[model samples]
Target: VHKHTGRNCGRKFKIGEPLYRCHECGCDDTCVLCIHCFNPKDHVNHHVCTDICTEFTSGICDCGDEEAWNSPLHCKAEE
Candidate 1:
Protein backbone atom coordinates (compact mmCIF):
# COMPACT_ATOMS: atom_id res chain seq x y z
CA VAL A 1 0.00 0.00 0.00
CA HIS A 2 2.99 2.30 -0.55
CA LYS A 3 4.24 4.22 -3.52
CA HIS A 4 7.42 2.14 -4.02
CA THR A 5 8.81 -1.16 -2.84
CA GLY A 6 12.39 -1.97 -1.79
CA ARG A 7 14.26 -4.15 -4.27
CA ASN A 8 15.94 -6.37 -1.72
CA CYS A 9 13.73 -6.20 1.32
CA GLY A 10 10.05 -6.97 0.98
CA ARG A 11 9.09 -4.64 3.84
CA LYS A 12 6.45 -2.21 2.67
CA PHE A 13 7.21 1.42 3.36
CA LYS A 14 4.86 3.15 5.77
CA ILE A 15 4.17 6.79 6.52
CA GLY A 16 7.07 8.77 7.98
CA GLU A 17 9.72 6.13 7.45
CA PRO A 18 12.87 7.32 5.73
CA LEU A 19 13.80 6.27 2.19
CA TYR A 20 17.39 6.08 1.07
CA ARG A 21 19.52 6.02 -2.04
CA CYS A 22 23.21 5.33 -2.56
CA HIS A 23 24.69 7.06 -5.54
CA GLU A 24 27.89 5.14 -4.92
CA CYS A 25 25.96 2.05 -5.92
CA GLY A 26 24.14 1.16 -9.12
CA CYS A 27 24.41 1.99 -12.75
CA ASP A 28 21.17 3.71 -13.73
CA ASP A 29 20.00 1.39 -11.02
CA THR A 30 16.71 1.14 -9.20
CA CYS A 31 17.88 0.04 -5.76
CA VAL A 32 16.35 2.01 -2.93
CA LEU A 33 15.31 1.36 0.65
CA CYS A 34 13.21 2.04 3.71
CA ILE A 35 14.86 3.01 6.99
CA HIS A 36 14.77 -0.51 8.33
CA CYS A 37 16.65 -1.87 5.35
CA PHE A 38 18.88 1.15 4.91
CA ASN A 39 21.02 0.29 7.86
CA PRO A 40 23.12 3.27 8.94
CA LYS A 41 25.90 0.85 9.73
CA ASP A 42 25.67 -0.58 6.24
CA HIS A 43 25.54 2.78 4.52
CA VAL A 44 27.71 4.89 6.77
CA ASN A 45 29.88 6.18 3.98
CA HIS A 46 28.24 5.70 0.62
CA HIS A 47 26.91 8.81 -1.04
CA VAL A 48 23.60 8.50 0.76
CA CYS A 49 20.47 10.26 -0.36
CA THR A 50 17.12 10.20 1.39
CA ASP A 51 15.48 12.44 -1.16
CA ILE A 52 15.79 12.36 -4.94
CA CYS A 53 14.55 13.98 -8.14
CA THR A 54 13.11 10.95 -9.98
CA GLU A 55 10.48 8.74 -8.42
CA PHE A 56 10.19 4.99 -8.90
CA THR A 57 6.61 4.47 -7.86
CA SER A 58 6.05 1.90 -10.57
CA GLY A 59 9.18 -0.21 -10.05
CA ILE A 60 9.97 -2.65 -7.32
CA CYS A 61 13.16 -2.31 -5.20
CA ASP A 62 16.45 -3.23 -6.87
CA CYS A 63 18.37 -4.21 -3.76
CA GLY A 64 19.37 -7.75 -4.54
CA ASP A 65 21.11 -7.29 -7.83
CA GLU A 66 24.82 -6.63 -8.28
CA GLU A 67 24.04 -4.63 -11.34
CA ALA A 68 21.66 -2.56 -9.29
CA TRP A 69 23.67 -1.85 -6.14
CA ASN A 70 26.74 -4.06 -5.81
CA SER A 71 26.31 -3.73 -2.06
CA PRO A 72 26.15 -6.72 0.22
CA LEU A 73 22.38 -6.53 0.39
CA HIS A 74 20.54 -5.73 3.55
CA CYS A 75 17.03 -6.53 2.42
CA LYS A 76 17.32 -10.01 1.04
CA ALA A 77 16.23 -12.96 3.20
CA GLU A 78 19.07 -15.12 1.89
CA GLU A 79 21.55 -14.17 4.59
Candidate 2:
Protein backbone atom coordinates (compact mmCIF):
# COMPACT_ATOMS: atom_id res chain seq x y z
CA VAL A 1 0.00 0.00 0.00
CA HIS A 2 1.32 3.44 -0.90
CA LYS A 3 1.05 5.39 2.32
CA HIS A 4 2.36 8.53 4.00
CA THR A 5 2.18 9.20 7.75
CA GLY A 6 0.82 12.68 7.99
CA ARG A 7 -0.80 13.64 11.29
CA ASN A 8 -3.29 15.92 9.58
CA CYS A 9 -3.36 14.65 6.02
CA GLY A 10 -3.01 10.89 6.22
CA ARG A 11 -3.21 10.46 2.48
CA LYS A 12 -2.56 7.19 0.69
CA PHE A 13 -0.71 8.20 -2.41
CA LYS A 14 -1.57 6.56 -5.70
CA ILE A 15 0.71 3.98 -7.27
CA GLY A 16 1.60 6.05 -10.35
CA GLU A 17 2.06 9.24 -8.40
CA PRO A 18 5.66 10.01 -7.48
CA LEU A 19 6.60 11.03 -3.93
CA TYR A 20 7.64 14.64 -3.26
CA ARG A 21 10.65 14.82 -0.98
CA CYS A 22 11.97 18.14 0.25
CA HIS A 23 15.64 18.99 -0.08
CA GLU A 24 15.32 21.62 2.60
CA CYS A 25 13.18 19.53 4.97
CA GLY A 26 15.92 16.90 5.14
CA CYS A 27 13.29 14.41 6.20
CA ASP A 28 14.39 12.17 3.36
CA ASP A 29 11.69 9.60 2.69
CA THR A 30 10.40 10.01 6.19
CA CYS A 31 8.49 13.17 5.29
CA VAL A 32 6.87 13.60 1.89
CA LEU A 33 3.78 14.95 0.16
CA CYS A 34 1.45 14.03 -2.67
CA ILE A 35 0.65 16.13 -5.75
CA HIS A 36 -2.50 17.47 -4.20
CA CYS A 37 -0.89 17.92 -0.82
CA PHE A 38 2.41 19.12 -2.17
CA ASN A 39 2.88 22.82 -1.71
CA PRO A 40 5.49 25.13 -3.13
CA LYS A 41 5.45 27.21 0.01
CA ASP A 42 4.26 25.15 2.93
CA HIS A 43 3.40 27.46 5.80
CA VAL A 44 6.38 29.82 5.75
CA ASN A 45 9.30 27.77 4.54
CA HIS A 46 9.75 27.79 0.79
CA HIS A 47 10.93 24.21 0.50
CA VAL A 48 12.29 23.03 -2.79
CA CYS A 49 11.22 19.66 -4.22
CA THR A 50 13.36 16.57 -4.66
CA ASP A 51 12.70 13.19 -6.19
CA ILE A 52 13.32 10.34 -3.79
CA CYS A 53 10.89 7.94 -5.43
CA THR A 54 9.84 8.45 -8.98
CA GLU A 55 7.78 5.30 -8.60
CA PHE A 56 7.55 4.73 -4.86
CA THR A 57 6.07 2.29 -2.38
CA SER A 58 4.49 2.67 1.03
CA GLY A 59 6.54 5.00 3.20
CA ILE A 60 6.21 7.16 6.32
CA CYS A 61 5.52 10.89 5.93
CA ASP A 62 6.76 12.82 8.97
CA CYS A 63 4.69 15.89 8.21
CA GLY A 64 4.01 16.75 11.79
CA ASP A 65 6.68 14.88 13.64
CA GLU A 66 9.12 17.48 14.85
CA GLU A 67 11.52 14.74 15.94
CA ALA A 68 12.17 13.17 12.58
CA TRP A 69 11.92 16.45 10.66
CA ASN A 70 13.65 19.16 12.61
CA SER A 71 12.30 21.62 10.08
CA PRO A 72 9.11 23.32 8.97
CA LEU A 73 6.18 20.94 8.61
CA HIS A 74 3.08 21.37 6.52
CA CYS A 75 0.60 20.01 9.03
CA LYS A 76 -2.69 20.70 7.34
CA ALA A 77 -5.43 18.30 6.32
CA GLU A 78 -6.38 19.45 2.83
CA GLU A 79 -9.74 17.81 2.96
Candidate 1: segments with Cα more than 4 A from true spot? 1-7, 14-17, 52-60, 63-67, 75-79
Error (Å) of candidate 2 at residue 63 is 2.4
lDDT (10s digit) by residue, model 1, range 12-46? 45544556778776465456765545556666677
Clashing pairs in 2: 5-61
Off by over 4 Å in 2: 1-6, 43-56, 75-79
- Model 1 score (lDDT): 0.55
- Enumerate clash totals for all models, in the order shown: 3, 1
Tens digits of per-residue lDDT for model 2 on 1-79?
3324445445666555666666666555467765555655663465656454434467644455565555665543443
lDDT of each: 0.55, 0.55
